[PDB]
Symmetry: C5
Subunit: 114 residues, 5 copies
């Protein structure tokens, strides 16, 4: 598995606009909301859940990095794997996307897989 | 269990105004105090205790997130479970509320369950 | 045991003026110096020793919180247990006080036990 | 082995211009892009993979230090070992350089091996 | 052993002017360069190596603290044990000093062991 696998989805030139932390079924988790920096498009929602999914090893790295990029409001590419979380009420509040990666974006390019 | 369960309570458009750390019965703990950004209402007090209650696994995550929102002073939704802590001098100093989640808010919406 | 036990001492409306990190007998330790915000009185010195005493589990939490309040210079309540540390030159350089809690005091009262 | 070994390469007076975090084969990883502070030359790309290569033990230290130097925009010397990473798609997006060390610089010199 | 043992050395009112992170012989390490705030004397270099020397338990504590003091530029007292590291090339680039403690200073006194 890799953040960059073409079975994962990504969204470029986004800003993390909201951050949430909680717990589900013994797992601390966090979710982020991101919107296009130019103000267009539809928001993206993705979550990371501690000890849950193949992406569990990266939970702390992603939490720390989402925190940083959130605090600067800088433009980023968000990488997700769709249809991972299955609790329907959780999915309805947030989404089923597992967050799998984060890349800074310049005015010209995003530093990550495409 | 989930932050979003309707057996938990929540308060929106609050700011973390005080923060305390300590230890009880060999467990690190922290408490926060939040007030409405607009000055109305009464304060919310909630505590997390590192090896107590079902919310134990997210102690560190909530401590780090509470520090972040405290240092920025931004408006948040605080999620609590009432009537958890039982030590009377502790409850009277702070409250019986366990802290179970923190959601950032924009001017119009809070990014978390409701 | 609890930060708020009446066998412990506390000093309100202080600021953290100095911070030291070191090691003794294979244990990381830190100490802080605090003074009344208003200049009155004498300083308080207290240390946490990572591997020693019932307060050991709270070492990291206390160090992280000591660092943050040190960096802001905001008013705090410092909570200590007196006469616990024993190495004579250590006590004489610093003190025999264990640091057992830190409360913010940005308001009328400090947010912690008294 | 050592960051300063003959058989590693280094590039001085660089600024960390991009940062990416992800996961590959159960291992969190991060990559950075650096460019010369004075605008000259060609960008350097280097990655660290938490469970892989002889540099694995330093993953957390390098991640934290890369993050700090990124957040400050300050001039650094970057040390890499060439031809480490093998997954072709990964190398194409980023590079095969393993990050093995970061050194801060002043105007004239960098504090690290030469 | 103790940071404050009189067999250790210390340098008061120093500014942490450079910082380096790397790896050696399986261990993450970091080194710092300090200079007297008043401009006098010679720079001090000291290093901490994860899981090496008696001071290994304090590696993360000292790294975090060295980062903080490095980022502020404030005046500090640096405590070292001399002649600890033996890698020849490593010592040539940096020094043999193990970092064993850091103390903040006011303009008139450092909050740490002396003598």
């Amino acid at each position: 598995e890799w953040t960059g696998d073409n079975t994962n989805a990504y969204y470029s030139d986004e800003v993390i606009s909201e951050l949430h932390v909680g717990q589900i079924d013994t797992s601390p988790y966090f979710c982020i909301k991101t919107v296009k920096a130019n103000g267009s498009g539809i928001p993206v929602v993705a979550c990371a859940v501690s000890k849950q999914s193949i992406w569990a090893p990266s939970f702390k790295e992603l939490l720390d990095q989402a925190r940083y990029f959130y605090s600067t409001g800088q433009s980023v590419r968000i990488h997700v794997q769709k249809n991972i979380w299955t609790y329907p009420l959780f999915v309805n509040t947030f989404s089923a996307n597992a967050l799998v990666g984060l890349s800074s974006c310049s005015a010209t390019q995003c530093f990550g897989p495409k």
